[PDB]
Amino acid sequence: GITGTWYNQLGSTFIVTAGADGALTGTYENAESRYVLTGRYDSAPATDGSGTALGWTVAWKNNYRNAHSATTWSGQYVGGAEARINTQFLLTSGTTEANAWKSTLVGHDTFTKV
Amino acid sequence: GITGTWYNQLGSTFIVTAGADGALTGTYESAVGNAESRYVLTGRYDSAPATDGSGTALGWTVAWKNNYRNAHSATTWSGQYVGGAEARINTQFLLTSGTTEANAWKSTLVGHDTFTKVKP
Amino acid sequence: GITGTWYNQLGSTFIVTAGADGALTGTYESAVGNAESRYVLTGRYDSAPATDGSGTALGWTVAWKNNYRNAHSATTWSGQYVGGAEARINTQFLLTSGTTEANAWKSTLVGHDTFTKV
Amino acid sequence: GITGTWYNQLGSTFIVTAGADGALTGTYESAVGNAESRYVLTGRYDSAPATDGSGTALGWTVAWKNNYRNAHSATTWSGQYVGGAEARINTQFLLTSGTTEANAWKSTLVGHDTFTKV
Numbered sequence: 001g002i003t004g005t006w007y008n009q010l011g012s013t014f015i016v017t018a019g020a021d022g023a024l025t026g027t028y029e030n031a032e033s034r035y036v037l038t039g040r041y042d043s044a045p046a047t048d049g050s051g052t053a054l055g056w057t058v059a060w061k062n063n064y065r066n067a068h069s070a071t072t073w074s075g076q077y078v079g080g081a082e083a084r085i086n087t088q089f090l091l092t093s094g095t096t097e098a099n100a101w102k103s104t105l106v107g108h109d110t111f112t113k114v
Numbered sequence: 115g116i117t118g119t120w121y122n123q124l125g126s127t128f129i130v131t132a133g134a135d136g137a138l139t140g141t142y143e144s145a146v147g148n149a150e151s152r153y154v155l156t157g158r159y160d161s162a163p164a165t166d167g168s169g170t171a172l173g174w175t176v177a178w179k180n181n182y183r184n185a186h187s188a189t190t191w192s193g194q195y196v197g198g199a200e201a202r203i204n205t206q207f208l209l210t211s212g213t214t215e216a217n218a219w220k221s222t223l224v225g226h227d228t229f230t231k232v233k234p
Numbered sequence: 235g236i237t238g239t240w241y242n243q244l245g246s247t248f249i250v251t252a253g254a255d256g257a258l259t260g261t262y263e264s265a266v267g268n269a270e271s272r273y274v275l276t277g278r279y280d281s282a283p284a285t286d287g288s289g290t291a292l293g294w295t296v297a298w299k300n301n302y303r304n305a306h307s308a309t310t311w312s313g314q315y316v317g318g319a320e321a322r323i324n325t326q327f328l329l330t331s332g333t334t335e336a337n338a339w340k341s342t343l344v345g346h347d348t349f350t351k352v
Numbered sequence: 353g354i355t356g357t358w359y360n361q362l363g364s365t366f367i368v369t370a371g372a373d374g375a376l377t378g379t380y381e382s383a384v385g386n387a388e389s390r391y392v393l394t395g396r397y398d399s400a401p402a403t404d405g406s407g408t409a410l411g412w413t414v415a416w417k418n419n420y421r422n423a424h425s426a427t428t429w430s431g432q433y434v435g436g437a438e439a440r441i442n443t444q445f446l447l448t449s450g451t452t453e454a455n456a457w458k459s460t461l462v463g464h465d466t467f468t469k470v
């Protein structure tokens with residue numbers, strides 16, 4: 001039950017649809033704040049109570065702005081009434097070769113159905 | 115630039131196409147790990163980079179299941195393309211596996227790959 | 235306020251002393267992993283932080299060898315202390331194991347721990 | 353094998369002493385960033401490694417403050433030492449700065465460094 005609307009604590013929001021083939025498509029977010037998303041998930045997880053692996057990408061360019069960057073989220077989906085997606089991310093900005101060593105940030109996030 | 119065939123330091127093969135819309139589609143084949151044959155990838159990239167010599171931000175995802183195997187896991191690559199005499203794509207990765215609640219502390223690997231158009 | 239006994243979300247115990255000019259010393263007990271009993275740690279912290287409401291940066295290291303067991307591994311924790319009603323330390327970690335050079339692509343785990351005194 | 357002078361591709365230098373008790377002590381001097389001069393380092397390493405051809409696990413920390421400048425930030429390195437005719441230390445790092453609560457999601461950078469005896 002990944003298909004739907006998810007929320008984090010800092011006010012961001014995303015709507016996804018999960019395909020039977022393992023595809024993930026949606027938008028991350030006013031129009032000025034919407035971005036395309038795309039990803040993949042394991043459409044045949046284990047039955048031993050492990051979570052379902054997935055990930056997705058967003059570049060921070062739309063018809064109105066371009067921050068010259070992209071983020072990837074990597075983590076897992078856990079069902080139940082407390083259904084959540086736990087992730088860790090990587091955010092990279094384009095840079096001159098001299099400044100590449102400080103081009104990527106790392107962090108974590110949790111999304112809920114409510 | 116980005117469209118084409120790439121090889122990393124491990125002998126893996128990354129075949130990709132860059133759309134005019136900022137979309138990334140293709141196929142991935144790994145030399146290491148619980149995998150065999152090709153897998154579907156999808157990603158995004160900045161289709162209008164700055165002009166000051168900076169790199170082009172990009173990223174993509176792979177879920178390790180196909181018609182031969184399933185490893186119950188997925189990897190995301192996050193990086194930048196740099197044009198030049200020697201074109202290359204430098205990245206960092208996060209590899210997450212499906213675990214129980216108890217072992218989630220050891221579910222994610224972190225690493226770094228460098229892709230190049232010549233096979234080393 | 236860094237000196238003292240802290241605990242994390244998994245059950246691990248971290249006991250620290252902060253020296254007058256940047257030293258960090260103490261022991262760690264992990265509630266999980268191939269571990270058993272106490273281990274030595276050592277680290278550093280910012281001894282003159284900004285006075286505009288930002289946190290205090292620090293880090294520390296542990297190697298998993300003691301008189302009872304050795305996992306041939308090490309962890310590093312990077313983060314910041316925040317003072318207040320609920321003093322907390324927010325970190326991220328890297329845990330590297332020794333491998334052959336062919337398995338090096340899978341040597342290092344990544345995650346995060348939050349410590350409190352409750 | 354570890355005690356001595358090491359160099360990275362960026363132009364930075366570090367001098368380290370590896371103790372018989374598993375400690376790492378020394379000095380670091382960067383070439384890139386908000387820093388000038390020497391800074392203190394401290395760490396730990398596996399003092400009874402295996403010989404199946406695995407490497408030796410280690411880690412260390414620097415806080416970016418000395419008698420000349422303060423950068424309100426800290427770095428930890430975690431990785432492994434590899435013997436051989438071309439010895440080296442392969443690592444990944446976490447660099448964290450002091451921030452307020454609102455900029456906490458963008459406080460930590462990640463990267464990798466290779467050190468040789470050159």
Ligand SMILES: O=C(O)CCCC[C@@H]1SC[C@@H]2NC(=O)N[C@@H]21
Pocket residue numbers: 122124126144145146147148149178185187189207209225227339
């Ligand atoms: O074993 C698995 O769980 C799936 C295979 C993972 C292969 C990884 S992805 C990061 C690194 N780069 C590669 O080309 N292969 C490995």
Ligand SMILES: O=C(O)CCCC[C@@H]1SC[C@@H]2NC(=O)N[C@@H]21
Pocket residue numbers: 219242244246263264265266267268269298305307309327329347
């Ligand atoms: O190599 C081992 O098995 C021992 C690792 C110790 C467990 C880890 S270290 C990061 C995380 N925080 C903890 O308190 N425990 C785990």
Ligand SMILES: O=C(O)CCCC[C@@H]1SC[C@@H]2NC(=O)N[C@@H]21
Pocket residue numbers: 101360362364382383384385386387416423425427445447465
């Ligand atoms: O606070 C700063 O801006 C300076 C920190 C030092 C720069 C980094 S630490 C990781 C990497 N390795 C180096 O030798 N220099 C950079």
